[PDB]
Design a protein around this nucleic acid. Structure first.
Ligand code: CTP
Ligand code: CTP
Ligand code: CA
Lengths: 441, 437
RNA sequence: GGAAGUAGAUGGUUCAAGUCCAUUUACUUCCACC
RNA sequence: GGAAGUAGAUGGUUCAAGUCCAUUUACUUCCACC
């Protein structure tokens, strides 16, 4: 099991075969023919145009180049026009920057409008750097595509490929820069082993330095962090995987792992072994794009976790899942049930003015003195984390994300017990509690 | 009803009737006759020697003055022999300083050996300051020394009289000094409201300055605090009580409240409504004096209390009770049961060597990363506060006071729920939980 | 949409809030959907 | 007996202990038992 023999096998998992390549060549040809004939300035960009796309992930990126004088309104009207004009069938769905997603001869295509700039300074739209990224990489990546494909494959198999909010990992463009920076997959992995949260990679300068955060300097624009949306945790996982890969190299690192169907009965056993409170907030999925929905689920998850922690339910971890129709916020707490009384701190016996109004209150028990200050016994209006959340989410829905919070206003319920183990959340449940052997292929 | 109308009606319960005084005089004489028969220099000090004892607190303090020639060990043997051959029956039991306690013609007596000195500063034993104390008070407390007996009665009714550990309150002498410093109990009550914990009262200089701590400076030794054993919380209680009295006066402030007997059934009801975990540590009371016991019971109570908090059972309060044959450490926690799993913080991801060690320990569940560490799920040995204290007391008996600890070491049990309300701890549980009716 | 920051405001909880729970106006950034 | 203080010496827990849990030696000051 030699390292180089491992990577040679890995190639068969990440290099697309002849039939896929040809399928994309045939599509490419058709697209060009349609876009000429339309007049229209365009440019193929991204992994297709650089032959760095992953086996089974063929998708062509076309960028339409407009006069910078155009309004943003004019950009979308025209982008959508041409995109629609050029794709066999199509779909329009985006967060901020408009574009058309479609198919040309059975292959995924994205037609994206942008601005024909010269110098990626000042930037009129979010995506204006992409043509420049391509000019830059074009001649610096020839002969190193398979190398980029290994890294991509390695990341994806470990669930940290892509910088969208659903994954918060490594973009494809980031993979290319790393390969340009280190020369090979093997060199990257070897080096990544010693990246820190303060690591700055400046590709254009061929330099590694200490900064305020992890920062991969864009060759085309130095104020840009190519790794802006890679989370601290995903960086950590990557660094750790590299360490593990070099200790014990294996083809396992390039094969995806799938959730495994775990029976409700065994889940009941694990939860009662841990003796925790496990429950979810269930509600209708708001009909919005992933990049709007996921940060909103992140916020909702966080605020309720914070509520649980200030309310002394000792939350362990937290998870979320989105189905076609429902979303789920998963929670685990050390405390299944708290007492009803608690102590509220009072004023120091010194100043009477405050002590007077502190004792003026009607309570059931009778304040006392401890360490030179008054304290009182007060009652909770809930004693289980479920009851707690039910109070929280009914009362604070507006702080849980624009659309997520709105959906919770109109309907939510709290599921625990067997009722929760038959929901499609077992993968997230297992992940959350760190159940061993979960997890396969 | 009004200002000084109440003080009249109280003086009935503080000043002793003539026939209690008459029993005590016929006991005083008999004592002089026995001591002089033996020769022996003797000074009378304390409350009886100043006419400041409560109606029922009849005790006589006698001090034996030994020449300094006799050493610390010679002192006590002769002081004991004298005390034994001067009291009808006698009891010897003390914490550090030797004395005989006994009865003459049916009257409580204390015989305490000490030294005769010129100059108070630079003590030999411990009580040497006391004759000096008295000779500073003989001509200063003269007159309406009933302003003391009201102050005493006040503090006694409210559970904060004596300055011994069981109480941690106001010394008898501390009372007589304040009456000299302010002029009268009422005037003392007026001022005590303004007292902080920074208050320093200098009877000698008439100086109400603000030092680092509550310090009643002794007229006989300025290095020494007369209030040195009154606790912070006990001070708080008085300062408040005075405020409560000043505004709305009542004779109730001089009557001791009946200790309040609540039935087991009502207590269980209170506790179940409270939703807490209430349990006690019961063990055999070690055969020691109060002043060695109570601080140990406190220890003890505190160390287990801290165990409970660092163990996330969120304790509310604690208390303790001493009986004939048993002691009880009383606890109430907000958490009746905790989960088996908990999180353990590991290292930051960069620190590759310590990550290896951390990840190499066998656990039931896969560790995880969160904000750049490395955390692990671990399993607890216990899930209930009672379960928890059973362990801590078993392993940490030695940190729980010399004797209390030794006693816990050989045996204790944990009493909770139904079994507990049958033990003599209900008054303590009521005070603890602030039960009110 | 989400996140950071700067300058105001409002409700609630509390003996007690610039600070805890929320709401809101103006502005400067940044990220994703490529 | 308990508490405060100064100089050390350990053992345990932990990825890691001058920081958490305990133990010990010497010098010191305090408190109650009056
Ligand atoms: N977060 C992102 C997303 C995209 N891009 C730019 O957009 C191009 C196209 O991105 P995308 O289609 O999302 O993926 P690819 O880079 O083409 O690679 P792959 O499809 O294999 O993920 C990239 O090359 C890059 O220049 C970027 O800079 N940062
Ligand atoms: N903590 C104390 C208590 C007592 N004493 C000295 O011991 C004398 C007698 O105190 P004690 O007999 O213990 O109580 P009484 O002063 O007699 O008060 P009472 O009779 O109400 O109990 C006091 O006058 C005082 O000089 C002292 O200095 N330190
Ligand atoms: Ca693409």
């Amino acid at each position: 099991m030699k390292v180089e023999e491992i990577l040679e096998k890995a190639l068969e998992l990440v290099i697309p075969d002849e039939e896929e390549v040809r399928k994309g060549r045939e599509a490419e040809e058709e697209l060009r023919r349609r876009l000429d004939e339309l007049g229209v300035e365009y440019v193929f960009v991204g992994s297709y145009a650089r032959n760095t796309w992953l086996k089974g992930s063929l998708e062509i990126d076309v960028f339409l180049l407009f006069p910078e004088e155009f309004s943003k309104e004019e950009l979308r009207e025209r982008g959508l026009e041409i995109g629609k004009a050029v794709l066999d069938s199509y779909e329009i769905r985006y967060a901020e920057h408009p574009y058309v997603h479609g198919v040309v001869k059975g292959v995924e295509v994205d037609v994206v409008p942008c601005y024909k700039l010269k110098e990626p300074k000042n930037i009129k739209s979010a995506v204006d750097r992409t043509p420049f990224h391509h000019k830059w990489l074009e001649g610096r990546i020839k002969g190193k595509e398979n190398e980029v494909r290994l890294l991509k494959g390695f990341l994806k198999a470990n669930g940290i490929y892509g910088a969208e909010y659903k994954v918060r990992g490594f973009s494809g463009y980031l993979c290319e820069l790393l390969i340009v920076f280190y020369g090979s997959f093997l060199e990257t992995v070897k080096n990544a082993r010693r990246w820190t949260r303060r690591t700055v990679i400046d590709v254009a300068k061929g330099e590694v330095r200490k900064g305020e955060e992890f920062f991969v300097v864009d060759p085309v624009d130095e104020k840009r962090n190519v790794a802006a949306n890679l989370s601290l945790d995903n960086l950590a996982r990557f660094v750790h995987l590299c360490r593990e890969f070099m200790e014990a190299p294996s083809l396992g690192f390039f094969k995806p792992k799938h959730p495994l169907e775990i029976e409700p009965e065994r889940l009941r056993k694990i939860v009662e072994e841990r003796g925790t409170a496990v429950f979810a907030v269930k509600f209708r999925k708001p009909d919005i794009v992933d990049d709007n929905l996921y940060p909103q689920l992140e916020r909702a998850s966080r605020k309720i976790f914070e509520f649980l922690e200030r309310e002394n339910f000792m939350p362990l971890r937290s998870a979320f899942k989105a189905s076609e129709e429902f979303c789920y916020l998963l929670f685990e707490c050390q405390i299944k049930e708290i007492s009803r009384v608690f102590r509220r701190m009072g004023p120091q016996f010194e100043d009477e003015r405050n002590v007077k109004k502190f004792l003026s209150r009607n309570r059931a028990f009778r304040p006392f003195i401890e360490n030179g200050r008054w304290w009182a016994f007060e009652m909770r209006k809930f004693t289980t984390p479920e009851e707690g959340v039910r109070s929280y989410a009914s009362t604070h829905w507006h702080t849980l994300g624009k659309n997520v919070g709105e959906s919770i206003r109109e309907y939510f319920e709290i599921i625990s017990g067997e009722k929760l183990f038959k929901e499609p959340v077992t993968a997230e449940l297992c992940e959350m509690m760190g159940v061993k052997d979960v997890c396969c292929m």
